Design a protein around this ligand. Structure first.
Ligand SMILES: [Mg+2]
Ligand SMILES: [Mg+2]
Ligand SMILES: [Mg+2]
Ligand SMILES: [Mg+2]
Ligand SMILES: [Mg+2]
Ligand SMILES: [Mg+2]
Ligand SMILES: [Mg+2]
Ligand SMILES: [Mg+2]
Ligand SMILES: [Mg+2]
Ligand SMILES: [Mg+2]
Lengths: 99, 152, 100, 127, 83, 114
RNA sequence: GGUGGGCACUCUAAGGAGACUGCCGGUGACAAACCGGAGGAAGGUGGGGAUGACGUCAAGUCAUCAUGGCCCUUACGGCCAGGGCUACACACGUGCUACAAUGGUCGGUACAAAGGGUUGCCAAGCCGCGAGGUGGAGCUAAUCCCAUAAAACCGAUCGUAGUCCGGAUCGCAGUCUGCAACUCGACUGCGUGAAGUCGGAAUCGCUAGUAAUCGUGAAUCAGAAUGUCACGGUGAAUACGUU
């Protein structure tokens, strides 16, 4: 009974990674629940833009962090342990727990 | 506004009495969003009115506003070299607003223990007209005859 | 942001980091209720032995490209007027303009 | 049996379950007056129920999350309206005339740069 | 003020220059720069020249200044007067 | 009746006036020496004024407190420490603003030259 | 929801539907469009944001950065101790707190949103009126911590008095970070208790979750916010009109 946690910055990569891992797990003979989405962390920054005194001239930037959870019921094939280089490619972080 | 597209919202949320003027008076006496404070103060005032006044307090209330509403109002217009004033008939909707505002602002200036019995005092005074709010109403009324010359 | 001043804050970084242990031990012994006034006082003396240029309070963090003492964002390492320049080019990962 | 409804108002979300009964009214397993302390909230909740003369025809079990007392009261009103219309689907026109099913879309406006409040501004001396 | 966990605070070289001093009676003011150091009743009667910004002002310690620091008896801002 | 005490007031409030007692120690005196805080000092029996006199004489009041604050003030002045000079000129001693807004320790505005 | 359990619901987050003057009536040069109605959660760019044309002010910045010139090279370049930027006869801008009874105290009491935390949050317990101290749990966090919202409501008291208002100032004694709280920190305990009775000429902000009022969080940061940015609770009055 393992659980997989996915961290990402943009949902475009995390959705693709979740679809890939779900399809691989269901194809290899495992039993998988429904991908669970967690509240996305939003970090807010506000910064002065002028090199000198203009206090009312701001710029607001945001960093979004997306959290996904998955579980494997009836662990029968640990093929996902040979696919990290493919499951995570550029900007998705994968944690596996309860091996 | 030049556009004249700004419509008005309708408020009618009388808790127990199921009236209309009562809620607008509630809003007038409400300060800084203290709606429940206004509830209890006005209801204590109305209880004092009911115990003092034999009849029901709502018709006493409307009779009191009947003796505070100004029929005509004076409004300064500058002819271009002199500071005049012009008497005009008050808008029918505006009469209730002036009545409520005057009654509240005059009940505020008594100086006794609380403004619940102040509101009761000027509610009974305005019920026939021995208060100060009626004094200001009649002064504003008589200013019209004082300036009837322009009128048009 | 004179380079001598950057050098003398970087050297402060090394001087602070290079002890990193005597401060902790001495202050822990001082804050320990049961250590006797002798170990209070010798620890005070020891703390006063080492150069003042060793504490974290003396350490004023600075932009890693310009060293501007003001306008810092410690989530990044850049200053106020380089974070925006890097962000508009897309170098900072997962940084956009926010409306909400 | 029973019917269900959901009412949202002023960041307040409420779930209502309607069953046969006489109107016991439970707010998170608590008395109605023990919850609504000296306010019109009871009357505003009872507005749509009494508009259709069904105060004693049903029993209600609700839960509320988020918001203030007025927001929760409005959420209860909206939710019980949506639950009641699920039972007697001929009174939708009556509620439309009464304007109870319509949700209140008003929401707190965010603060902006250069302003104290969402719309308040500093004093602006011109000299 | 400094918590009761730490009673005194004195510059260590100041402590050595005062403790060695008491072997003989008050004969010469002692030059000091650290305005922060506390003073106990064990240098009473000694004259200490504390740095002020441009000069070392000499002050003769007595027993009635145990609870006041070195800098309190030396003013750094002049303010001779507006007119 | 203490030292020029008022009447028609609750015990704690009446006791507060004796320059050395506020809300806390007045409450402590009221609770320790059995009296009703609600009861007005006018209706209190003579059995309690003596106890309150003992409590008042226990700690400090009036002349001794004035004398010790004045002794402290002159103690600060005569040495010549910075706080002593600060209290001498009447300027604030805690270290607040003197460029502006130091009014309660200067008096009225007292405009320039005349 | 503590447990077994469920995929009902709320919720969380991805993809879609929906609002387009679409339908009906009238006006309209049988046009554009306007004024109504039905339905609908939402109706007339639904609400808010990001988005700033050609140019103007030789507008601001050589001190964030880069750069043409000019300038010093035993100094206008470097290092270290203290001091000042927090000074003080006055004047002005922007704010916080009040001058009270729609209030100040006492008792128990119900409901938020948003966010930060492994060079970190720091629980339980115990010792202190108190700021705090020992303690070590849980947590890389919808899982543990910050963390008990407040105004609101009920009962008791004060009775309009410079006062059970108001807190400046000051005296004494303390907690905490910091090598070090004199210059020059923030809070805590006792005591003292000011001006202030709603403010002249003049002048400002705001059209609906708006004003007003109540609290919470983050950045910078060892410590230091009445400032900046951000989030919710309660919640109005007024607009006939364009001289
Ligand atoms: Mg350079
Ligand atoms: Mg620092
Ligand atoms: Mg919002
Ligand atoms: Mg708000
Ligand atoms: Mg002005
Ligand atoms: Mg319509
Ligand atoms: Mg110029
Ligand atoms: Mg220096
Ligand atoms: Mg300065
Ligand atoms: Mg008080």
């Amino acid at each position: 009974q393992i659980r997989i946690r996915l961290k990402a910055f943009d949902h475009r990569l995390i959705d693709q990674s979740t679809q890939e891992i779900v399809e691989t797990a269901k194809r290899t003979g495992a039993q998988v629940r429904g991908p669970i989405p967690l509240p996305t962390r939003k970090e807010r920054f506000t910064v002065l833009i002028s090199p000198h005194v203009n206090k009312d001239a701001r710029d607001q930037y945001e960093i979004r962090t997306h959290k996904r959870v998955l579980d494997i019921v009836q662990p029968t094939d640990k093929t996902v342990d040979a696919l990290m280089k493919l499951d995570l490619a550029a900007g998705v972080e994968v944690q596996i727990s309860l091996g | 506004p030049r556009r004249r597209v700004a419509a008005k919202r309708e408020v009618l949320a009388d808790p127990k009495y199921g009236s209309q003027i009562l809620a607008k008076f509630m809003n007038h006496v409400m300060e800084s969003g203290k709606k429940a404070v206004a509830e209890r103060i006005v209801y204590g005032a109305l209880d004092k009115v009911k115990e003092r006044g034999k009849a029901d307090p709502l018709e006493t209330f409307e009779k009191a506003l009947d003796a505070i509403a100004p029929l005509v109002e004076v409004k300064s217009r500058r002819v271009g070299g002199a500071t005049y004033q012009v008497p005009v008939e008050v808008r029918p909707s505006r009469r209730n607003a002036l009545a409520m505002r005057w009654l509240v602002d005059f009940a505020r200036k008594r100086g006794e223990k609380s403004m619940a019995l102040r509101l009761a005092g000027e509610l009974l005074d305005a019920a026939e007209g021995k208060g100060a709010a009626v004094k200001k109403r009649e002064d504003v009324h008589r200013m019209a005859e004082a300036n009837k010359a322009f009128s048009h | 942001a004179k380079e001598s001043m950057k050098n003398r804050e970087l050297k402060r970084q090394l001087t602070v980091a290079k002890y990193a242990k005597k401060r902790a031990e001495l202050k822990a012994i001082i804050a320990n209720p049961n250590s006797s006034a002798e170990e209070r006082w010798n620890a005070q003396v020891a703390l006063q032995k080492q150069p003042r240029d060793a504490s974290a309070s003396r350490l004023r963090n600075r932009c890693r490209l310009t060293g501007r003492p003001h306008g810092f964002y410690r989530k990044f390492g850049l200053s106020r007027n380089k974070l925006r320049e890097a962000a508009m080019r897309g170098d900072v990962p997962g940084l956009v303009k926010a409306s909400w | 049996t029973q019917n269900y409804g959901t009412g949202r108002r002023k960041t307040a979300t409420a779930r209502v379950f309607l069953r046969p009964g006489t109107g016991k009214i439970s707010i998170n397993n608590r008395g109605l007056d023990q919850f609504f302390g000296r306010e019109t909230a009871r009357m505003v909740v009872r507005q749509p129920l009494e508009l259709t003369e069904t105060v004693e025809k049903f029993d209600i079990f609700v839960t509320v999350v988020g918001g203030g007392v007025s927001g929760q009261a409005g959420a209860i009103r909206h939710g019980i309206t949506r639950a009641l219309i699920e039972y007697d689907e001929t009174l939708r026109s009556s509620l439309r005339k009464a304007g109870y099913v319509t949700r209140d879309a008003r929401e707190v406006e965010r603060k902006k740069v250069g302003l104290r409040k969402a719309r308040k501004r500093p004093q602006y001396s011109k000299r | 003020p400094r918590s009761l966990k730490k009673g005194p605070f004195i510059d260590l070289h100041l402590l050595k220059k005062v403790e060695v001093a008491v072997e003989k009676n008050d004969r010469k003011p002692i030059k000091t720069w650290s305005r922060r150091s506390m003073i106990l009743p064990h240098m009473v009667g000694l004259t200490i020249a504390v740095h002020n910004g441009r000069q070392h002002v000499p002050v003769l310690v007595n027993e009635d200044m145990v609870g006041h620091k070195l800098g309190e008896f030396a003013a750094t801002r002049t303010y001779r007067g507006h007119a | 009746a203490g030292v020029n005490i008022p009447d028609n007031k609750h015990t704690v409030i009446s006791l507060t006036y004796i320059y050395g007692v506020g809300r806390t120690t007045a409450q402590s005196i009221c609770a320790a020496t059995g009296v009703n805080p609600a009861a007005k000092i006018k209706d209190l029996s003579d059995e309690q004024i003596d106890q309150l006199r003992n409590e008042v004489a226990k700690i400090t009041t009036e002349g001794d407190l004035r004398r010790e604050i004045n002794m402290n003030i002159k103690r600060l002045m005569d040495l010549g420490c910075y706080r002593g000079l600060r209290h001498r000129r009447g300027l604030p001693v805690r270290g607040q603003r003197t460029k502006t807004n130091a009014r309660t320790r200067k008096g009225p505005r007292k405009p320039i030259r005349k």
